[PDB]
């Protein structure tokens, strides 16, 4: 009854009034490529390292099952499809979303969305949490708060799925294209701090051909960051 006209993403959609986590359901269940798992609310939503992700009613909490036929070296780029898709959807609603490398989107430096990719070999799950009309934790924002009025949640869903389908289809053809879109919509030229096994500060210059964040430290040393288990903090 939804009438989606996408090629892969959105071929099937499983909607839940409530779920533990769309990412967990997607990783666990036997699902075909392109199936979207979406829920009004999540009771156990999470980000990286099992950190809690607040998922009250009003927001867009979904996961997409992907089976990309691409070399191992290209899989780390899937998170960017989610980040860019969100930025494109936000621009459609006239919201200035900017990417915080490599899995978040901010509006005036406040987090409005997060992306979490999980994958075991053949199946890759692309999880996206976007604050639309829901209450958010301090330090975050939502589409409603930015526009000053409620936004039709289904319209946001339709917009995002359409954008993601296009981005994904092109990714399979030209896996490098997404990097340019990330560059054009990411926060750069400002000081950041990388928190991993130890830490360091510097200017976030750009992302390289592998999607690694290029940081120039005050000494001039250049470091290439692979997100993994590191956190980026703005100064």
Ligand X SMILES: Nc1ncnc2c1ncn2[C@@H]1O[C@H](COP(=O)(O)OP(=O)(O)OP(=O)(O)O)[C@@H](O)[C@H]1O
The binder of 140, among ligand X, ligand BTN, its own copies, none, by C-beta within 5 to 8 A per type, is ligand X
**Number of residues binding to ligand X, judged by CB under 6 A:** 18
- List 44, 70, 147, 154, residue binding its own copies (CB under 8 A): 154
Decide if residue 129 touches ligand BTN (CB under 6 A).
yes
Q: Count how many Cα atoms sit within 13 Å of the Cα of residue 180 in the half-sphere of its side chain.
A: 7
The piece of 70-78, 131-139, 159-167, 178-186 that touches ligand X (CB under 6 A) is: 131-139
Gap between the Cα atoms of 4 and 158, Å rounded: 8
Decide if residue 101 touches its own copies (CB under 8 A).
no
Span 135-174, contacts to ligand X by CB under 6 A? 136-137, 140
- The 8 Å CB, 24+ separation contacts for 224-231 are 225/194, 226/76, 227/79, 227/101, 227/102, 227/103, 228/196, 229/48, 229/49, 229/196, 230/194, 230/195, 230/196, 231/194, 231/195, 231/196
- Give the nearest distance from C-beta 3 to its own copies in angstroms: 6
Region of 132 on the Ramachandran plot (φ > 0 left; ψ -120 to 50 alpha; else beta): alpha
Residue with tokens 């099952």, as numbered in its chain: 65
- Adjacency order of strands within the sheet including 198-207: 222-225, 213-216, 198-207, 191-196, 231-234
- List 114, 127, 202, 211, residue binding ligand X (CB under 6 A): 114
CA distances from 207 to 147, 184, 199, 214, 222 (A): 30, 11, 19, 5, 12
CA distances from 154 to 8, 58, 132 (A): 19, 11, 11
Decide if residue 199 touches ligand X (CB under 6 A).
no
The piece of 5-13, 44-52, 90-98, 164-172 that touches its own copies (CB under 8 A) is: 5-13
- List 4, 16, 54, 191, residue binding ligand X (CB under 6 A): 54
The piece of 6-14, 43-51, 84-92, 140-148 that touches ligand BTN (CB under 6 A) is: 43-51
Chain residues that interact with ligand BTN, rule: CB under 6 A: 21-23, 42, 45-48, 53, 55, 61-63, 103-104, 114-116, 127-129
Residues found near ligand X in the complex (CB under 6 A): 47-49, 51, 53-54, 100, 103-104, 111, 114, 129, 131, 136-137, 140, 231-232
Binding site for its own copies (CB under 8 A): 1-4, 6, 10-17, 38, 40, 57, 60, 62, 153-154, 156-157
């Amino acid at each position: 009854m939804l009438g989606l006209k996408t090629s892969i993403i959105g071929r099937r959609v499983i909607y839940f009034q409530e779920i533990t986590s769309t990412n967990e359901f997607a990783k666990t269940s036997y699902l075909e490529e392109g199936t979207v798992i979406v829920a009004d609310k999540q009771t156990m939503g999470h980000g990286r390292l099992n950190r809690k992700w607040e998922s009250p009613e009003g927001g867009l909490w979904l996961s997409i099952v992907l089976s990309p036929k691409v070399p191992q070296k290209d899989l780390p780029k899937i998170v960017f499809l989610g980040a860019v898709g969100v930025v494109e959807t936000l621009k459609e609603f006239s919201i200035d979303g900017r990417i915080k490398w490599p899995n978040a989107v901010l509006v005036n430096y406040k987090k409005i969305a997060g992306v979490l990719v999980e994958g075991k070999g053949d199946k890759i799950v692309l999880g996206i949490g976007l604050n639309v009309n829901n209450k958010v934790p301090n330090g975050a924002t939502s589409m409603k708060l930015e526009l000053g009025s409620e936004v039709p949640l289904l319209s946001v869903f339709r917009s995002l799925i359409t954008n993601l389908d296009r981005l994904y289809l092109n990714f399979l053809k030209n896996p490098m294209d997404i990097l340019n879109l990330v560059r054009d919509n990411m926060i750069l030229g400002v000081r950041v701090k990388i928190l991993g096994d130890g830490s360091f500060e510097g200017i976030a210059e750009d992302i390289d051909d592998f999607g690694r964040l290029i940081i120039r430290l005050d000494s001039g040393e250049v470091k290439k960051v692979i997100y993994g288990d590191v956190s980026l903090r703005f100064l």
